[PDB]
């Protein structure tokens, strides 16, 4: 069939699975583990399918897909069959990632281009979004995701500072989070965490926290730095999943739903599973 599966995610009911390939098709599949019933094909892009993502149920089951065209062509089942419900193109230069935000964060659509620019819009059925962009990195953004959870501002007016936080990863070895500001022009950058000597690849935040927020920033320097935020709002300190160069070229590194079990996809086609050890460092569970 496909000789190569690049990456492949699932919906939020766990009945569908969307395969990003490289022959420009998005094959929507039905998840039954290894076997799948191919229900649809959506060819209509240029070059490798880098990323697709499924919408959080309360803003459809919308599927926003990016290829090397540098455009997100959004697909939506209208009539029980796939069609095109939208188009985007404010940044073209290859859209690498294409994410939907948590329920509380809204139907925000995270675009991250390799021109050092990043869009952040809203999905509308009546149309209209205001074009808000903030510059992340400079040599490009090879992956983007979504910050942990929305915060609370207390007082008499909620949703003031922090709020929707955007985490990105450029090719200039720099990983950091934001803080949506409304009193200082562009998004005031936090702290530049330089701990990389080769381009940043994948970034994932842990939807499981205790007293610190974990941020797995992968790189092509064959290590994964785990950024432990001290008391969750403290500084980001250096905690090493492995201190040494793995003889594996690491790609994705995505956390589980519960737990701080992290899967890192090694270049030798072996997905190690890491748990944090007897100390603050990490040891493999497999």
């Amino acid at each position: 069939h496909n000789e190569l599966i690049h990456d492949a995610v699932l919906d939020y009911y766990g009945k569908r699975l969307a395969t990003c390939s490289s022959d420009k098709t998005i094959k929507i599949f039905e998840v039954e583990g290894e076997t799948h019933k191919l229900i649809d094909t959506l060819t209509g892009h240029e070059g490798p399918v880098w990323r697709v993502d499924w919408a959080h149920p309360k803003f459809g089951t919308i599927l926003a897909s990016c290829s090397y065209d540098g455009k997100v062509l959004i697909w939506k089942e209208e009539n029980g069959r796939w069609s095109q419900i939208a188009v985007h193109a404010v940044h073209s230069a290859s859209v690498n990632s294409v994410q939907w935000a948590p329920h509380e964060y809204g139907p925000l659509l995270l675009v991250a281009s390799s021109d050092g620019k990043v869009s952040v819009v809203e999905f509308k059925e009546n149309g209209t979004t205001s074009p808000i962009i903030i510059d992340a990195h400079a040599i490009g953004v090879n992956s983007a995701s979504w910050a942990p959870a929305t915060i609370e501002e207390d007082g008499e007016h909620n949703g003031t500072k922090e709020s929707r936080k955007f985490v990105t990863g450029g090719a200039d070895n720099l990983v950091k989070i934001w803080k949506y500001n409304s009193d200082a022009q562009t998004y005031v950058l936090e702290s530049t965490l330089e701990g990389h000597s080769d381009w940043v690849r994948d970034v994932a935040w842990s939807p499981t926290v205790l007293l610190r927020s974990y941020l797995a920033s992968v790189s092509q320097d064959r290590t994964c730095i785990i950024w432990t935020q001290d008391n969750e709002q403290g500084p980001w300190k250096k905690t090493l999943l492995k201190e040494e160069k793995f003889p594996d070229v690491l790609w994705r590194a995505s956390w589980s739903l519960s737990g701080n079990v992290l899967a890192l996809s090694g270049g030798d086609n072996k997905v190690t599973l890491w748990k944090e050890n007897l100390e603050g460092k990490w040891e493999p569970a497999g």
């Binding site: 409304s182 009193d183 200082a184 022009q185 562009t186």
Partner: protein
């Protein structure tokens, strides 16, 4: 809100005085008997009582002072509508030609329906008590020049 024993005696005395003045108009040979005077004297008095509760220095009476200002403002409103009802049922007449501006038409509409006229007086009352914002809370970061 919080009554306090001291101020409660004053509460009764200034409101009792407003009445004492009204009975004074009725025996007096030099003074019109009009009920609109009564309401007005309560309006002043409600206002003085909040000040006096502020001036105590008690944090609890500061709370009452806010409630009593509210009551004092309510009398003002009350006065205006009660005058209107009892005296003003037509405005000066305006022209009815179709070539007249928007303005002559607005005025003529207020002469017919006095209900909206009431709607406007309350609206003015809300407005006055609502302050016009201060300077912008987010100025440019020296854009365009770049």
């Amino acid at each position: 809100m919080e009554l306090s024993p001291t101020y409660q005696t004053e509460r009764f005395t200034k409101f009792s005085d407003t009445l004492k003045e009204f009975k004074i108009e009725q025996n007096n040979e030099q003074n019109p008997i009009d009920p609109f005077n009564i309401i007005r004297e309560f309006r002043s008095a409600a206002g003085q009582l909040a000040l006096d509760l502020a001036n105590s220095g008690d944090e609890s009476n500061v709370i009452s002072s806010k409630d009593w200002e509210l009551e004092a403002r309510f009398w003002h409103l009350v006065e205006l509508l009660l005058v209107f009802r009892n005296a003003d049922l037509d405005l000066d007449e305006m022209e009815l030609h179709p070539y007249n501006s928007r303005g002559l038409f607005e005025k003529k509409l207020m002469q017919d329906n006095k209900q909206l006229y009431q709607i406007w007086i309350v609206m003015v009352w809300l407005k006055e008590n609502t302050y016009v914002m201060e300077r912008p809370k987010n100025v440019p970061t020296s854009k365009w020049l770049n």
